[PDB]
Design a protein around this ligand. Structure first.
Ligand SMILES: *[C@@H]1O[C@H](CO)[C@@H](O[C@@H]2O[C@H](CO)[C@@H](O[C@@H]3O[C@H](CO[C@H]4O[C@H](CO[C@H]5O[C@H](CO)[C@@H](O)[C@H](O)[C@@H]5O[C@H]5O[C@H](CO)[C@@H](O)[C@H](O)[C@@H]5O)[C@@H](O)[C@H](O[C@H]5O[C@H](CO)[C@@H](O)[C@H](O)[C@@H]5O)[C@@H]4O)[C@@H](O)[C@H](O[C@H]4O[C@H](CO)[C@@H](O)[C@H](O)[C@@H]4O[C@H]4O[C@H](CO)[C@@H](O)[C@H](O)[C@@H]4O[C@H]4O[C@H](CO)[C@@H](O)[C@H](O)[C@@H]4O)[C@@H]3O)[C@H](O)[C@H]2NC(C)=O)[C@H](O)[C@H]1NC(C)=O
Ligand SMILES: *[C@@H]1O[C@H](CO)[C@@H](O[C@@H]2O[C@H](CO)[C@@H](O[C@@H]3O[C@H](CO[C@H]4O[C@H](CO)[C@@H](O)[C@H](O)[C@@H]4O)[C@@H](O)[C@H](O[C@H]4O[C@H](CO)[C@@H](O)[C@H](O)[C@@H]4O)[C@@H]3O)[C@H](O)[C@H]2NC(C)=O)[C@H](O)[C@H]1NC(C)=O
Ligand SMILES: *[C@@H]1O[C@H](CO)[C@@H](O[C@@H]2O[C@H](CO)[C@@H](O[C@@H]3O[C@H](CO[C@H]4O[C@H](CO)[C@@H](O)[C@H](O)[C@@H]4O)[C@@H](O)[C@H](O[C@H]4O[C@H](CO)[C@@H](O)[C@H](O)[C@@H]4O)[C@@H]3O)[C@H](O)[C@H]2NC(C)=O)[C@H](O)[C@H]1NC(C)=O
Ligand SMILES: *[C@@H]1O[C@H](CO)[C@@H](O[C@@H]2O[C@H](CO)[C@@H](O[C@@H]3O[C@H](CO[C@H]4O[C@H](CO)[C@@H](O)[C@H](O)[C@@H]4O)[C@@H](O)[C@H](O[C@H]4O[C@H](CO)[C@@H](O)[C@H](O)[C@@H]4O)[C@@H]3O)[C@H](O)[C@H]2NC(C)=O)[C@H](O)[C@H]1NC(C)=O
Ligand code: POV
Ligand code: PTY
Ligand SMILES: *[C@@H]1O[C@H](CO)[C@@H](O[C@@H]2O[C@H](CO)[C@@H](O)[C@H](O)[C@H]2NC(C)=O)[C@H](O)[C@H]1NC(C)=O
Ligand SMILES: *[C@@H]1O[C@H](CO)[C@@H](O[C@@H]2O[C@H](CO)[C@@H](O)[C@H](O)[C@H]2NC(C)=O)[C@H](O)[C@H]1NC(C)=O
Ligand code: A1ADN
Lengths: 290, 333, 254, 105, 208, 119, 60
């Protein structure tokens, strides 16, 4: 009947328990220790100015109502115990659309230690907004942020803290890279406060530093543009007694430049300024026209 | 008033976790299908859409009552309170019931315990299209369904005499294909779970070659005759004939790209791309023929002179002959 | 009546059942055996670096609480009782988006056996991430995989293994893909360490070889043919500048 | 590690004036620098945590500022009880402390 | 192409319920969001929205906050895809005005009253919005009553005036065509003895 | 695609009441507890009922037992087009609805006003 | 544009050849594109007939 005694423990633990009230509701500030494990860093959508990320989101706090004594020091419980207790209402500030995975069951985890400490881990995918400045495209670098904090609980009630040294609290898996066009140079974390229209909230920020790889754009735009410039200049060495041939050279090179200029922008969002690639194509078009 | 009493007595002490005749004999289920429409058939994903009303009837001696009321005509409210067969469609990429404005479901319970249970479904059913002879390709691809967890010893399905009924077929979404008939089948399949009675409906679809005609066949042959036009141009006008041939070639390659982009990336050769490849060979032949004629001008004038006229006849005759062979072989297959 | 016997048996089995505790909660790990029947592999996409497969995912374990000896038959129950029983918290680590098919009912099975063996199946479609090396494309081979792991239960709480250890996965040879051929597949058992413990893992992986003929026809042939048509310019006399330049420029454009 | 270069090594100012202590971080430390006041023969006392957050019991004249690598501690209108050593430390990574700064009159 | 914009916002609602009044506790009770399922909330909806959701990670992004007098502050993080019918007669030199209509579905104007808390500062964050192709030139708040066959209903309208930036189109479609016309003009400087050259110029220019 | 307020009205004698109010403007969740017609769209493909921020529904019970029930829908419906005159073609796109599960001997539908003014 | 070619003198052969070739290629492109916008119906629309007649004129 070891299952029966553990059932009795669990039932005594939830008796007179109000999951609507945070631990230390009127007499203490709840401190949520936070940890992120990045199982993969999804692709970066330049057109949408966003990036996907898969993580294990780990949260730990202390709930004095959940102290227990039994033959175990920790209770590894099925994730439907978390719905019966208070849990923090963390959200991603710059999250566009995220998903808490639940195949084949809710990808959640709840460990209760006998002193009342909780560990609450989730697997979730976050599409986050990454504002980008593309003046140096395709040779640009970005710091894509991931900001989270409490919804509805101000700094006076819930504060967030990294579980380990801030520099070691966001860990990226070795093989977890779904980046095609970019390179993940490293990550940075910080903590701060944002004043909303509902109060003062703690915000935890991570910045993922990405450097774009130029290879695709070299082969697809720069080499074709240089090739068309070379071809346009090769027409000088032809004899002056061949007007149709040099005319064909000029017109076809201009046509190729126009096609390339239409093609190049299609990969980037429709920003209102000129990038480095735009300047290169403009100079190549000028050379062909000249 | 007393239909409430009948309903309350039926459900009292009733377990919907247990199929009727749990440890006695298999539950027999008679199935009917009304096909509202057979949707588009996209070969890219090798799937087709179908909207049906799916009727299932079985006997539950627990749903047995005695009253002047002979049949209880119910909505979906009571569906979840009785035992329902767990029928699923085996070759469905995805499927869904309908829920507006309420669940499109129907339940009728008869005096003797017969249950009729109908619901409306749209299904994206997987079928593997062997695209040899495309676009003169005919397919008969299925809609299979069975019980998920109940093997043959527990649930057996049975087609009624008039089980599958189709509507008009004039309002369906079949553009490339025409519905030509159907048939039903039953069998037993072995799985790691057990032996399952599997029911199948086969819909016979034949592609109609009217879109592909004007999209690929007419443009390609017109490009070929345009290539022929070169044989009448004066042999001295070199840029004219060279440009004619090479532009024909680039138009041919663009047309080939589009035509093949019509369908999925299959490694084998279809009937359409054999036609396109032969047209490309013809255009290439015209251009190289002009090149050789111009080369022979400098060596032998009579050779080139007679070569032009010989090509003028050998090209169209060869194209007509290839057309005859191609269409005879593929249309009569 | 046998219906009454089954009804009382199931009621007794479900009475006082604590769904929050795994079988042998304080004792040794519960061993879960895995079976997979692959219905199809749907869309191997290089753009999204992923693929979709549909499978009959089945799990089996012993639960002494769900044992009965009054009737001699295996009890298949309506799949709603799965919400009342403990089932393992299996998840696929690399899957991007998944669902259980739900027509005409949720496609899951729950079957009890007299000694306590539970048999729990699910029809699942997963879009699984698969990073493809395209350096040798289209003459490339891809090795994708599905990672199967326990989320909450560490390796001292649960054990994963293939039932059969080589026949655990079926239906692979029946899969036809328009662009790939399944070279072979492997089943791997391992344990992975995270900051929160070590967890059981099963890996099923496929080696996919790309077919060449489609690429031959669509992109290789035309390139050779344009190169040969460019060569044709050498047999044209140097006097014809317009003809030769048209040939070369048009070949470059093609 | 992360080197916290604190300057000046020492400095003196009369009572009533404003002073600015500065601390330079080698790498990026975000806002994870704290300022400590250590009076002679006493243990350090936390003044500023975060980067600009007065610890409880800290008068309102002490105030910190800065982010990333540059940080400063301005003591406005120093009194006679503000004579001590002032240490800056980073807690972004394993802690490192600045060499210190002595304040005389 | 879809004639619609997507906006994400923190949508706050405030009213008073005398039933939810308390006097033993002096402070404001922030409660777990799941209690909102047990309270009356207004049946607010967006008439022009096409598809919308409340963000649900890590939990449902909603806020419930009570006050001793009974005031309830109800907050949601929403993403709505509002229909934005656009007149493109001046595209890409066009200025577009699409809005969000906020109305009570079931409560007529004698059951419920809508107003903007602040009435001029009720909407925030507009000046910080950066659209790559547009720039928010102006926004307005309106209070109306709309009449249907089932009664008359309170309505609030939030409007945005979007001016489209033109630089992208200069880089993409205006400059190339201008340059192609300049190219066309070269034909008149080529000796009119050359037929192949001039026809090449003209035809290539047309096709480009 | 069509966005509608779909209004239905029937008499339920079991829902007669006598109180200070002549009409009960009731919440959208009361409707779940009473019988409502199971109207569905014969040519509907994939319709949605909006529940932002709450179910976009409405229930009004008159003292005599008359019910008014409206809901906000986006209906997507099949419109079989005959494109022989394209692009000079005109079409009549149907919208057919009726009762699933109730035959004409049990549930009938009528337009609330003159048929020419009911849509 | 195809009919403009009739006003060029009979000596400017490559000019008229380019006119004919480019007009036919344009018509083929114009035909593919105009068929893009529609459901892949198996019959011919009015637009199809107009395109076919214009192609016939260019070819003639
Ligand atoms: C991972 O997480 C996922 C997200 O959480 C999760 O998905 C969710 O799964 C659950 C359960 O599997 C789903 O809940 C079920 O939904 C069924 C309906 O499914 C269709 O509709 C839902 C939306 O549901 C709305 O519509 C129905 C009917 O129209 C209403 O009943 C609902 O309450 C709800 O209506 C509200 O919202 C409307 C706006 O949409 C409002 O207008 C309205 O007023 C309400 O406010 C869709 O989401 C579904 O789509 C999804 O699933 C399909 C599956 O194929 C996918 O294809 C698709 O892509 C989506 O993924 C689908 O379209 C409900 O029928 C069901 O509730 C019944 O069953 C349960 C269990 O049996 C009962 O407990 C429950 O009470 C209901 O039974 C009553 O009603 C039936 C009706 O037939 C009766 O037959 C029955 O006897 C019983 O009657 C009793 O109650 C009646 C009152 O209700 C009363 O009248 C009777 O008298 C009697 O007392 C259940 O709620 C949920 O929708 C999924 N959500 C999503 C987003 O997918 C996923 O499973 C997780 N995965 C894993 C592996 O864990
Ligand atoms: C698709 O891609 C995946 C991922 O790479 C491939 O999966 C790999 O498959 C190979 C072959 O099965 C795996 O290699 C195996 O590793 C085991 C673990 O080795 C450790 O432990 C053993 C003792 O337990 C130590 O000996 C060793 O030093 C390591 O510390 C080995 O146990 C396996 O057997 C080895 O040892 C025995 C006994 O000495 C020898 O007889 C064997 O020959 C061999 O040397 C074996 O080495 C590899 O781990 C898998 N990778 C992953 C990440 O799991 C797929 O194969 C690939 N293709 C397909 C179609 O799936
Ligand atoms: C459209 O929008 C509306 C309103 O926004 C949504 O309606 C909500 O639907 C959810 C899910 O169905 C409702 O949440 C459910 O609450 C039920 C009852 O909760 C009360 O009553 C029980 C007593 O029966 C008390 O225990 C509880 O304290 C509450 O007082 C529960 O039956 C449901 O529980 C389910 O999930 C929990 C999760 O822990 C499990 O424990 C259960 O086993 C069960 O699986 C659930 O909690 C919510 O109340 C509805 N709102 C309102 C105002 O009624 C529609 O769902 C939405 N439509 C769509 C399609 O999304
Ligand atoms: C984007 O697009 C939206 C929608 O088109 C615009 O919203 C309109 O904004 C204007 C002004 O902001 C609104 O016009 C206002 O109407 C009010 C109510 O009108 C009543 O009274 C008039 C007679 O005065 C009657 O004809 C009418 O039928 C109503 O009975 C007026 O009260 C407003 O003020 C007017 O009167 C006062 C009197 O003191 C004057 O001082 C004002 O100058 C003004 O003359 C005003 O007229 C209009 O109703 C809005 N449309 C809708 C559908 O509501 C946005 O303005 C537009 N731009 C932006 C940036 O979003
Ligand atoms: C007329 C056109 C004018 C220049 C066109 C040349 C384009 C090459 C662009 C830079 C070279 C490069 O990085 O590409 C790769 C191809 O190596 C070659 O350079 C391929 C040349 C054959 C070289 O990469 P890698 O092989 O790793 O070599 C070390 C990288 N490194 C070059 C930065 C040291
Ligand atoms: C003819 C064929 C030439 C070679 C074939 C293709 C080359 C391969 C692509 C080059 C490439 O990817 O190199 C990148 C760097 O290039 C670069 O750094 C690009 C440098 C500029 C392009 C080279 C030519 C420009 C100058 C030519 C002058 C013209 C004068 C003529 C009058 C790689 O880098 P990564 O970021 O992808 O990955 C991180 C690694 N470093
Ligand atoms: C559907 O299935 C039924 C039963 O399997 C078929 O009906 C039988 O038709 C044959 C004639 O071919 C008769 O001899 C049998 O008496 C019929 N059986 C019953 C039970 O009616 C029917 O042909 C099938 N429909 C098809 C194949 O389209
Ligand atoms: C609960 O909230 C109310 C209003 O948000 C707070 O009352 C405000 O108190 C501040 C601080 O004194 C004043 O600036 C405002 O004038 C007050 N507003 C109103 C409407 O009274 C109240 O202080 C909060 N409760 C607690 C314990 O802080
Ligand atoms: C794979 C690949 C990528 C790019 C190119 N390409 C090269 C080009 C540039 C460098 C080396 C060889 C060809 N020039 C061009 C010049 C003008 C217009 C297009 C191209 C072009 O598309 C060819 C193949």
């Amino acid at each position: 009947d070891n299952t029966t005694v553990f059932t009795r423990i669990l039932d005594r633990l939830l008796d007179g328990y109000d999951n609507r009230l945070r631990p230390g509701l009127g007499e203490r500030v709840t401190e949520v220790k936070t940890d992120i494990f990045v199982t993969s860093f999804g692709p970066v959508s330049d057109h949408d100015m966003e990036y996907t990320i898969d993580v294990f989101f780990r949260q730990s706090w202390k709930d004095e109502r959940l102290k227990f004594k039994g033959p175990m020091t920790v209770l590894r419980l099925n994730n439907l115990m978390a719905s019966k207790i208070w849990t923090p209402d963390t959200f991603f500030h710059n999250g566009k659309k995220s998903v808490a995975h639940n195949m084949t069951m809710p990808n959640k985890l709840l460990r209760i230690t006998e002193d009342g400490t909780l560990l609450y881990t989730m697997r979730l995918t976050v599409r986050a907004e990454c504002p980008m400045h593309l003046e140096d495209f395709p040779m640009d670098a970005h710091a894509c942020p991931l900001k989270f904090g409490s919804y509805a609980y101000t700094r006076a009630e819930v504060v967030y803290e990294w579980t380990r040294e801030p520099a070691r609290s966001v860990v990226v898996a070795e093989d977890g890279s779904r980046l095609n066009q970019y390179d993940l140079l490293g990550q940075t974390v910080d903590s701060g406060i944002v004043q909303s229209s509902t109060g003062e909230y703690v915000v935890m920020t991570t910045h993922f530093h990405l450097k774009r790889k130029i290879g695709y754009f070299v082969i697809q735009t720069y080499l074709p543009c240089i090739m068309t410039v070379i071809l346009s200049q090769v027409s000088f060495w032809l004899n002056r007694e061949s007007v149709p041939a040099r005319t064909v050279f000029g017109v076809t090179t201009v046509l190729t430049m126009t096609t390339l200029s239409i093609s190049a922008r299609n990969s980037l969002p429709k920003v209102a300024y000129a990038t480095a690639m735009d300047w290169f194509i403009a100079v190549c078009y000028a050379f062909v026209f000249s | 008033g007393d239909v409430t009493v009948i309903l309350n007595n039926l459900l009292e002490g009733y377990d919907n976790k247990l199929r009727p005749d749990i440890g006695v004999k298999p539950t027999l289920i008679h199935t009917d299908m009304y096909v509202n429409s057979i949707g588009p058939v996209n070969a890219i994903n090798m799937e087709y859409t179908i909207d049906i009303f799916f009727a299932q009837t079985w006997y539950d001696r627990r749903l047995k009552f005695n009253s002047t009321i002979k049949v209880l005509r119910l909505n979906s409210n009571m569906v979840g309170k009785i035992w329902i067969p767990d029928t699923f469609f085996r070759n469905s990429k995805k499927a869904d019931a309908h829920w507006i404005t309420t669940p499109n479901r129907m339940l009728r319970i008869w005096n003797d315990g017969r249950v009729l249970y109908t619901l409306r479904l749209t299904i994206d059913a997987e079928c593997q299209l062997q695209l040899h002879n495309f676009p003169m390709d005919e397919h008969s691809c299925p809609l299979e369904f069975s019980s998920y967890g109940y093997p043959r010893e527990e649930i057996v399905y049975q087609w009624k005499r008039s089980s599958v009924e189709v509507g008009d077929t004039r309002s369906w979404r079949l553009y490339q294909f025409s519905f030509v008939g159907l048939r039903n089948t039953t069998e037993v399949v072995k799985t790691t779970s057990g032996d399952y009675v599997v029911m199948s409906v086969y819909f016979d679809l034949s592609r109609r070659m009217g879109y592909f005609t004007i999209q690929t066949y007419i443009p390609c042959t017109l490009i070929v005759v345009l290539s022929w036009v070169s044989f009448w141009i004066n042999k001295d006008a070199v840029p004219a004939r060279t440009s004619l041939g090479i532009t024909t070639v680039l138009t041919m390659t663009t047309l080939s790209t589009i035509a093949r982009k019509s369908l999925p990336k299959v490694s084998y050769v279809t009937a359409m791309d054999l036609f396109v490849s032969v047209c490309f060979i013809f255009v290439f032949s015209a251009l190289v023929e002009y090149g050789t004629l111009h080369y022979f001008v400098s060596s032998q004038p009579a050779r080139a002179a007679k070569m032009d006229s010989y090509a003028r006849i050998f090209f169209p005759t060869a194209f007509c002959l290839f057309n005859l062979v191609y269409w005879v072989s593929y249309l009569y297959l | 009546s046998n219906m009454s016997l089954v009804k009382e048996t199931v009621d007794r089995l479900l009475k006082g059942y604590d769904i929050r505790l795994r079988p042998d909660f304080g004792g040794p790990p519960v061993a879960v055996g895995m079976n997979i029947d692959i219905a199809s592999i749907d869309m191997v996409s290089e753009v999204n670096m992923d693929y979709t497969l549909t499978m009959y995912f089945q799990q089996a374990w012993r639960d002494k609480r769900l044992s009965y000896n009054v009737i001699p038959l295996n009890l298949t129950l309506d799949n709603r009782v799965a919400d009342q029983l403990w089932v393992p918290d299996t998840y696929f680590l690399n899957d991007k988006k998944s669902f259980v098919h739900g027509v005409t009912v949720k496609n899951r099975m729950i079957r009890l056996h007299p000694d306590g063996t539970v048999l729990y199946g699910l029809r699942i479609t997963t879009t699984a991430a698969c990073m493809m090396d395209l350096r040798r494309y289209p003459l490339d081979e891809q090795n994708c995989t599905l990672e199967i792991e326990s989320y909450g239960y560490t390796t001292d709480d649960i054990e994963f293994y293939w039932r059969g250890d080589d026949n655990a996965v079926t239906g692979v040879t029946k899969i036809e893909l328009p662009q790939f051929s399944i070279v072979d597949y492997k089943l791997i058992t391992k344990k992975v360490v995270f900051s929160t413990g070590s967890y059981p893992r099963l890996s099923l992986s496929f080696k996919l070889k790309r077919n060449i003929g489609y690429f031959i026809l669509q992109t290789y042939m035309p390139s050779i043919l344009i190169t040969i048509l460019s060569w044709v310019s050498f047999w044209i006399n140097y006097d014809a500048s317009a003809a030769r330049v048209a040939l070369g420029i048009t070949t470059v454009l093609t | 590690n992360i080197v916290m270069t604190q300057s000046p090594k020492s400095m003196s100012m009369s009572v009533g004036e404003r002073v600015t202590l500065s601390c330079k971080a080698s790498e990026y430390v975000g806002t994870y620098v704290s300022w400590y006041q250590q009076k002679p023969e006493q243990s350090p006392k936390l003044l500023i945590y975060g980067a600009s957050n007065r610890y409880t019991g800290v008068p309102d004249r002490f105030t910190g500022s800065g982010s990333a690598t540059d940080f400063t501690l301005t003591i406005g209108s120093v009194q006679a009880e503000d004579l001590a050593d002032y240490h800056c430390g980073q807690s972004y990574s394993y802690p490192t402390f600045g060499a210190g700064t002595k304040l005389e009159l």
